[PDB]
């Protein structure tokens, strides 16, 4: 999660630079002369075994989707058994057959994974 | 009496298929294909590039089938004969 910033003025991409003196992280633009202090110090992230994309597809209409399969488990938020489940939408071989369900009453995504590690699933 | 809202049975499908074939026959993919050409797509080709730097081409008229008779009448051509 290296959420990265564009300049206030010219709206190009900002590139990380060091304040050599005070030892801290700037982010100059290389078009205008704009610069801002860095938020996190994290400049780069490479997620080898990824998650983001497993949730991708979750729309206000996902349940209107007739091709989706429908189970009657209970959602850990509103208990309604109007669910519509799909497998992790990432398209890796090294994906599980972990099901994701969407509560069609409170639009809550929950999981069949008994090894739950994440909180937002995003 | 045979409620005209009674659900369809597996048998009835054939009726609908009969209708389908009554209407389209077995080679509609050909005919319609060729027809949409003759009716529209044809005339639509005579309007693209129908301008020369003038001479512009307008309507298209497709005759009934006919023969270039060597010695004689441009003749109504019947498929069998042809």
């Amino acid at each position: 999660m290296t959420t990265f910033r564009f300049c206030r003025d010219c709206n190009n991409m900002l590139y990380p630079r060091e304040d050599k003196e005070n030892n801290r992280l700037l982010f100059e633009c290389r078009t205008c002369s704009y610069v801002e202090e860095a938020g996190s110090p994290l400049v780069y992230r490479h997620e080898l075994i990824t998650n983001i994309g497993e949730t991708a597809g979750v729309v206000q209409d996902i349940g209107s989707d007739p091709t989706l399969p429908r189970s009657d488990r209970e959602c850990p938020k509103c208990h309604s058994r109007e669910n519509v489940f799909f497998q992790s939408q990432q398209r890796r071989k090294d994906t599980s057959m972990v099901l994701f369900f969407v509560c069609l009453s409170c639009s809550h995504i929950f999981t069949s994974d008994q090894k739950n590690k994440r909180t937002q699933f995003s | 009496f045979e409620d005209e809202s009674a659900p369809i049975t597996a048998e009835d499908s054939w009726a609908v298929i009969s209708a389908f074939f009554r209407e389209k026959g077995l080679v509609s993919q050909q005919l319609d294909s060729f027809n949409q050409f003759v009716d529209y797509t044809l005339q639509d080709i005579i309007c693209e590039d129908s301008t020369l730097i003038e001479i512009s081409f307008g309507k298209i008229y497709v005759t009934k089938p006919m023969v270039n008779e060597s010695d004689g009448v441009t003749h109504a051509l019947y498929p069998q004969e042809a």
């Binding site: 030892n23 780069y44 490479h46 080898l48 075994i49 | -």
Partner: protein, 147 residues
Amino acid sequence: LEPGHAADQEQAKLIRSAIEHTTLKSVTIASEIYYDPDPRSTVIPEDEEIIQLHFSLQQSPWLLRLELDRAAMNDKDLTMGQVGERIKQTFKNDLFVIWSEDNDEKLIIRCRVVAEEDHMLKKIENTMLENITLRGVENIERVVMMK
């Protein structure tokens, strides 16, 4: 397996691991390049304990921090020390290497170049994840045991 040890399901494994080409890629959860300028105090909590521990019986402010996965980490019968002193013997001195030890709940290799830095690092990060051979014979990818 050598005549005397054929049944040893554990030696079949021990050979399997010491044969199956095992790259850094296969054992690292994620890489991250931090700006972390002070080589003593650190803008990363989970590493304060590890720099302290590497002061008991040059460097760029840019840090390449690898978080490794125990699962595949002990599965391939591997030490932090081993992964570590591998990278440290792959990049001569041209890289300052330091790693969390094998007890610490998070396994971490922290690496610095030793200014065009953020770019030499994304290169080195790749020269690690792809190229470096932690364990095994190159080209041996799967190694299945069978009776």
